[PDB]
Write a protein that binds this DNA or RNA. Structure first.
Lengths: 215, 114, 120, 122, 48
RNA sequence: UAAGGAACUCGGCAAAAUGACCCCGUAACUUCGGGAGAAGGGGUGCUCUUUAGGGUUAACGCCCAGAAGAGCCGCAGUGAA
RNA sequence: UUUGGCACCUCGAUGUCGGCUCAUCGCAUCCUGGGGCUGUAGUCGGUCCCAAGGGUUGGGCUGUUCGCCCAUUAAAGCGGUACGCGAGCUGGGUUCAGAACGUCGUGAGACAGUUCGGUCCCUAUCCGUCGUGGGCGUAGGAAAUUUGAGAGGAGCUGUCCUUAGUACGAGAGGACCGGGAUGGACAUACCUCUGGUGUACCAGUUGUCGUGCCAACGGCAUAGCUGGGUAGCUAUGUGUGGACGGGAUAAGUGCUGAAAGCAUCUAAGCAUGAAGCCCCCCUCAAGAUGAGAUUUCCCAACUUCGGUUAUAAGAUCCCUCAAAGAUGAUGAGGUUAAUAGGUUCGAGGUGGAAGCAUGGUGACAUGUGGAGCUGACGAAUACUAAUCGAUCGAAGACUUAAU
């Protein structure tokens, strides 16, 4: 339960108990507000919809996206609220607690919990195979010509084709990833941030879909 | 704020009683070893090799010879496991890192004070 | 930063000769990126010669070539003297910019998205 | 970084002056090791006399790598040369006039024997 | 690493469908100028 | 390029490392010629002093030094090739 | 899965053993587990059965196919796939032409008996595969969030201690047993830490050319050489992960029966039990042509609202950029503006600028001064430019029953 969103700022180190060092990651969750409240009879699943960060309201000559649009506003208004910029849903939580218009706060958590962080990868570009995958490569001397490329791609004339699931090169990219069973250091409420044991997926000023583990 | 936030948190953890120094200096360092029994202190004495960027990350290093055996110990600054620090001496250096001393033993590894 | 698909030494030399000639003319025609990246350079040269200190004089003589404008009435001076005597005053009040730029059309030989650059 | 085919000095008086290694035990596929660990090795430059003679197979124990370690305190320790010490299938050494410094991270290794045998420890 | 069969013209033309060239914008000059691309120096019948 | 240092490999192929000049020392074996640049060591920067020269010398001066000291600075002194 | 036999395809070419890289399937199972067994008291060994899910070292010596050995490991399996793969690598060996030796041969030459040496081509058209877009369609149009039909991925072990030296035991060995602490390997996410890199950062330093000389700068000398090093990219550096738990289970093992009037690990029950199946967790997923579901916004003024001008919600062109990136897609912004740059400050890094002054015969030193400089980083400031403007863009079809 107890989901929340934010974005990623940086990492530091902390002298916890015992003079113990901990590298840690900082998260600026902020103005996190409920916008809808789904149901099983209405929407087939009992769940909620949440927005993270407000943005500019409707305007004209809106070429970028800091400003919303009419239906965005209409969604932002059905609850007494403003134009968000990032929006997601949650199922794990119980909804009977929550209530639309809320501002689910960073103080919902404590230090010392179990969470599954879900963000994206940085993404790097188009990459060879020993980078995309742990393919240890070939010689560089003793008169060779097989340095970084792969070699084989499949079997012989029998099954004269190439299977799928091959680990050829491609794009080494941002993609979904859910770590598990991290934990929490301290729950600020002035800057309204959180500090978490370790590192998270994604570059700075990104996005993070924090919630609770179970195990 | 997008820029002062980090420091605004980590100021809670930093320490202030500590002095200022720089490379060239000969130092004594009282440190709080918790053995399985107690919280016994001991001292290391050494020579300021380096220190790098600020914050909690300000973090430094000292050199010593035990038995003709060069030893290097490298510590955070604002860790609590220091009880105390002393500037035993200074020295006229012209670098900011002293990696060029791991090779030498003796009067070759000699320093001017101040 | 940008490289120009050219080597570092050639690059540096090109940029400085660029800014030299630029100072002579007060505007020129060239490509896009070469202008994009002589931009910041000569902005900084102005930021220097706005001060007239001998230190900055020395620092600029690094970059400025050793050139002679024959000014009017058979009068001659260098890019340096010009910079520290004619141009600092002009933007003496201003807090950035100091230049502007003018997209134009391709060239014939290439798809050279060419540009004029000038002072502001 | 310690792997096999790596030259170790010794720091006891069993009879060996220098060794190099064969192995790093532990688990299958285990490649490398640092302080606190048990290996095998074979001497290549021995002391005339002593117990341990050139060409002999031996277990040993790690001390004071140059790629030193860092601890739960977030503090670091290094040295300026590697070294080893030989044992007796019991975490018991052979030579007993040990030289030079030694680390602290081997109390847990139940070489407190050796630490008490040692000079300054850190 | 060479052709085994021939390229049928249908297959050729199929491939070079997206082998095209799109267009320029070419607005007017309500700012200052005749019919000329938006927000631009006189390229043809223009002032701004 | 850490750290390890031929585990690679059919094979240290390649790459690495050496190198200039000055000084000191250089075995076995030899058809006595040689081996032998054996090996292996050490040294070279800058200023002042001359005492003293190669004298550049007319001569200390001209620079190189007679080349001996004292000092200055650097991680590093055939600082490159 | 040997030696072979038959000569069906292939000699107007099916063109190479091993090894490297990368695999992938079986099980007649090496570890792993579970049971039953033992000439097994537990273990031992051994026997059988269940089980294939995963995993199943590094070196020395022969090209040698093989095999032996040194260390380990929980084990260090057997096999299949053009004796897995050379339009992916080497060619160590063949087989080439040189040459030597031994033997045979009148000899030319032969053997194989060895030996040294001796040239491995190809711009990928189709399928296929990994990624990326474009097109169009889901009976109104758009924006956003989503269910998930299914698909892919994941299941390895080892250890200290507590219960427990307890059961077993003939003690030794030593449990099964729950935990945490664990470690390795493996896959993952990140650069706070350690370190590398750092070619537009800082310093030092040789030669040499120009700036008459001087210095000072600059050029060239692998970035001239050396030391350091920001951002970012990084691992050897940081943190994660594995396990379960459910069933349905299997070998099985327990049960209760009847036929075989008995009985007898369902033939109709009861159970339990495997890293087995499923669930279990992660990811992709309505082109799922079946095209899903919710919320919001737009709705031809003319007008069979056809159809134009229009038009709206909405998009696009263009432009400043980068958390993205071959391209294009993605994203952030486009003057009501901090998107970039500049300017200012800061951070951080480097290591005490110049000019003065003093000292010093001089080289040099001190103070002025944590100075002076500072690319990518941070804030702020509209000083500069992203302005004019254009293009597209619907008009809710029928049938039937409800309404």
């Amino acid at each position: 339960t107890k989901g929340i969103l934010g974005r990623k700022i940086g990492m530091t180190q902390v002298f916890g108990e015992n003079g113990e060092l901990i590298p840690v990651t900082v998260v600026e969750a902020k103005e996190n507000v409920v916008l809808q409240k789904k149901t099983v009879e209405v929407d087939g699943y009992n769940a909620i919809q949440v927005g993270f960060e407000d943005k500019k309201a409707y305007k004209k000559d809106a070429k970028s996206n800091k400003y919303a649009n009419k239906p965005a506003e209409g969604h932002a208004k059905k609850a007494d609220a403003a134009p968000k910029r990032f929006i997601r849903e949650f199922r794990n939580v119980d909804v009977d607690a929550y209530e639309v218009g809320q501002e689910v706060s960073v103080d919902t958590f404590v230090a010392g919990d179990v969470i599954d962080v879900t963000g994206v990868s940085k993404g790097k570009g188009f990459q060879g195979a020993i980078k995309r995958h742990g393919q240890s490569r070939g010689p560089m001397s003793h008169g060779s010509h097989f340095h970084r490329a792969p070699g084989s791609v499949g079997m012989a004339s029998d099954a004269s084709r190439v299977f799928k699931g091959q680990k050829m090169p491609g794009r080494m990219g941002g993609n979904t990833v859910t770590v598990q069973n991290l934990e929490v250091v301290q729950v600020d409420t002035e800057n309204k941030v959180i500090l978490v044991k370790g590192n998270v997926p994604g570059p700075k000023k990104g996005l993070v879909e924090i919630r609770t583990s179970i195990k | 704020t997008n820029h002062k936030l980090i420091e605004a948190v980590t100021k809670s953890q930093l320490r202030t009683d500590l002095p200022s120094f720089r490379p060239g200096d000969t130092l004594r360092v009282h440190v709080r070893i918790i053995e399985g029994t107690r919280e016994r202190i001991q001292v290391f004495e050494g020579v300021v090799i380096k220190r790098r960027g600020g914050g909690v990350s300000e973090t430094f290093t000292v050199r010593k010879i035990s038995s003709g055996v060069g030893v290097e110990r490298t510590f955070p600054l604002h860790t609590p496991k220091i009880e105390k620090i002393e500037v035993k001496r200074r020295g006229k250096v012209r670098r900011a890192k002293l990696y060029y001393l791991r090779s030498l033993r003796g009067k070759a590894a000699r320093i001017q004070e101040i | 930063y940008r490289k120009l698909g050219r080597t570092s030494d050639q690059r540096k030399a090109m940029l400085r000769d660029l800014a030299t000639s630029l100072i002579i003319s007060e505007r020129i025609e060239t490509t896009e990126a070469r202008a994009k990246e002589v931009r910041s350079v000569v902005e900084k040269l102005i930021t220097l010669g706005k001060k007239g200190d001998l230190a900055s004089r020395r620092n600029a003589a690094k970059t400025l070539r050793n050139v002679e404008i024959l000014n009017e009435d058979e009068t001659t001076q260098t890019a340096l003297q010009k910079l520290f005597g004619e141009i600092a005053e002009r933007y003496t009040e201003r807090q950035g910019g100091y230049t502007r730029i003018l997209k134009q059309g391709p060239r014939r030989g290439d798809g050279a998205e060419s540009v004029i650059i000038e002072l502001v | 970084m310690i792997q096999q085919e790596t030259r170790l000095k010794v720091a006891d008086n069993s009879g060996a002056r220098e060794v190099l290694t064969i192995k790093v035990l532990g688990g299958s596929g285990r490649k490398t090791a640092n302080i606190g660990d048990v290996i095998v090795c074979t001497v290549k430059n021995a002391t005339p006399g002593g117990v341990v003679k050139k060409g002999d197979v031996v277990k040993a124990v790690i001390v004071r790598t140059k790629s030193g370690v860092r601890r739960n305190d977030g503090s670091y320790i290094k040295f300026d040369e590697n070294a080893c010490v030989i044992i007796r299938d019991d975490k018991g050494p052979r030579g007993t006039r040990i030289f030079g410094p030694v680390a602290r991270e081997l109390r847990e290794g139940n070489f407190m024997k050796i630490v008490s045998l040692a000079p300054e420890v850190l | 690493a060479v052709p085994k069969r021939r390229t049928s013209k249908t297959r050729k033309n199929k491939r070079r469908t997206h082998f095209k060239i799109s267009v320029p914008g070419m607005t007017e000059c309500p700012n200052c100028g005749e019919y000329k691309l938006s927000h631009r120096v006189c390229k043809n019948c223009g002032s701004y």
